[PDB]
Amino acid sequence: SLPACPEESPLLVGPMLIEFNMPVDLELVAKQNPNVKMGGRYAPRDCVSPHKVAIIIPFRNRQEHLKYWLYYLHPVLQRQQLDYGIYVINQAGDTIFNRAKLLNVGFQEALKDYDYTCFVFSDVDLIPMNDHNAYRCFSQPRHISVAMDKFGFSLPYVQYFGGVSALSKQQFLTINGFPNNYWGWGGEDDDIFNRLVFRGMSISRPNAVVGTTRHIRHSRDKKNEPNPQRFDRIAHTKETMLSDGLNSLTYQVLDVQRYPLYTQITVDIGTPS
Numbered sequence: 001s002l003p004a005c006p007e008e009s010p011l012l013v014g015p016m017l018i019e020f021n022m023p024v025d026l027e028l029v030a031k032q033n034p035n036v037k038m039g040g041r042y043a044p045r046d047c048v049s050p051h052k053v054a055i056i057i058p059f060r061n062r063q064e065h066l067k068y069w070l071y072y073l074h075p076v077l078q079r080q081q082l083d084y085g086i087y088v089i090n091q092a093g094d095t096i097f098n099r100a101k102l103l104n105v106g107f108q109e110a111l112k113d114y115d116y117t118c119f120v121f122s123d124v125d126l127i128p129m130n131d132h133n134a135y136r137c138f139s140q141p142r143h144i145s146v147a148m149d150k151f152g153f154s155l156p157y158v159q160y161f162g163g164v165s166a167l168s169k170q171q172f173l174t175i176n177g178f179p180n181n182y183w184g185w186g187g188e189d190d191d192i193f194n195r196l197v198f199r200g201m202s203i204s205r206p207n208a209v210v211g212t213t214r215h216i217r218h219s220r221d222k223k224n225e226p227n228p229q230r231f232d233r234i235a236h237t238k239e240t241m242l243s244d245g246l247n248s249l250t251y252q253v254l255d256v257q258r259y260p261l262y263t264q265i266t267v268d269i270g271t272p273s
């Protein structure tokens with residue numbers, strides 16, 4: 001009988017220095033994080049966390065960003081005293097990218113590993129600047145990346161729900177997960193915001209200082225061009241969410257790799273139907 005972890009972690013140091021211009025060596029990060037177990041799993045040795053968190057990263061062709069992510073997050077997530085695992089959902093193939101479908105795959109496959117009850121959905125190029133910005137679930141859906149540098153350290157609009165967010169297992173199931181048919185860039189986070197509002201929820205957020213986040217500057221990805229149907233799509237979420245999401249999801253996992261600091265699920269999610 002380990003006792004419960006304190007409600008807020010005593011380990012946190014607050015604001016942090018973040019930079020992206022040095023090389024990163026994941027063997028060395030592994031050695032700096034000796035307590036992270038194979039597949040990027042950690043829980044505290046001294047107490048039991050109520051936070052059973054799968055962190056889900058949609059991914060293709062961003063290995064350099066991913067090493068920064070893992071270098072910065074792993075120490076922060078342990079200081080937060082979370083029982084967590086990292087999942088990188090790698091889109092097989094070279095056709096148009098589908099962020100939100102990959103996120104659904106992540107939810108469904110992490111559940112096969114462990115009784116996770118919280119899901120964090122994080123883009124791979126967003127790093128929090130303050131470890132008081134909690135990477136776990138709340139009684140309402142949680143928007144985490146609230147004051148990104150690239151939007152002037154505030155929200156680009158008050159209904160913005162992109163970047164990094166957290167939903168409990170019950171919140172995600174309540175909205176039928178995320179939509180599967182936003183192919184290419186834009187709009188799927190707005191649809192997900194729509195979904196939560198249509199199911200009676202509201203967005204919880206840390207303050208702008210605690211929520212300061214850095215984005216790793218990068219040029220445009222090929223095969224994730226702006227989706228021209230995105231404006232039409234987000235205008236119909238209430239109706240389309242009933243039968244587009246978790247209850248219409250299929251995919252084929254091609255490969256699961258347990259690396260020391262993460263599990264990578266390589267997955268064929270198809271093209272538009």
Ligand SMILES: CC(=O)N[C@H]1[C@H](OC[C@H]2O[C@@H](O[C@H]3[C@H](O)[C@@H](O)[C@H](O)O[C@@H]3CO)[C@H](O)[C@@H](O[C@@H]3O[C@H](CO)[C@@H](O)[C@H](O)[C@H]3NC(C)=O)[C@H]2O)O[C@H](CO)[C@@H](O)[C@@H]1O
Binds near residue numbers: 187231
């Ligand atoms: C529905 C949707 O697209 N939601 C996303 C939202 O989009 C807002 C806005 O983004 C603009 O691109 C920005 C981008 O968001 C920034 O991250 C980046 O730094 O710079 C880009 C350049 O400013 C789009 O240009 C804009 O699209 C335009 O929207 C108007 C109507 O509002 C249309 O009439 C016009 O046709 C359309 N133009 C083009 C060229 O496509 C619009 O998408 O941005 C957030 C934050 O990035 C995303 O998370 C949301 O998914």
Ligand SMILES: O=c1ccn([C@@H]2O[C@H](COP(=O)(O)OP(=O)(O)O)[C@@H](O)[C@H]2O)c(=O)[nH]1
Binds near residue numbers: 058124
């Ligand atoms: O080719 C791609 C496209 C996007 N992504 C992932 O999806 C997120 C969202 O895309 P992004 O905001 O970076 O697009 P952009 O800034 O170019 O408009 C990224 O942070 C990555 O986690 C990826 O891994 N490879």
Ligand SMILES: [Mn+2]
Binds near residue numbers: 125215218
């Ligand atoms: Mn980006």
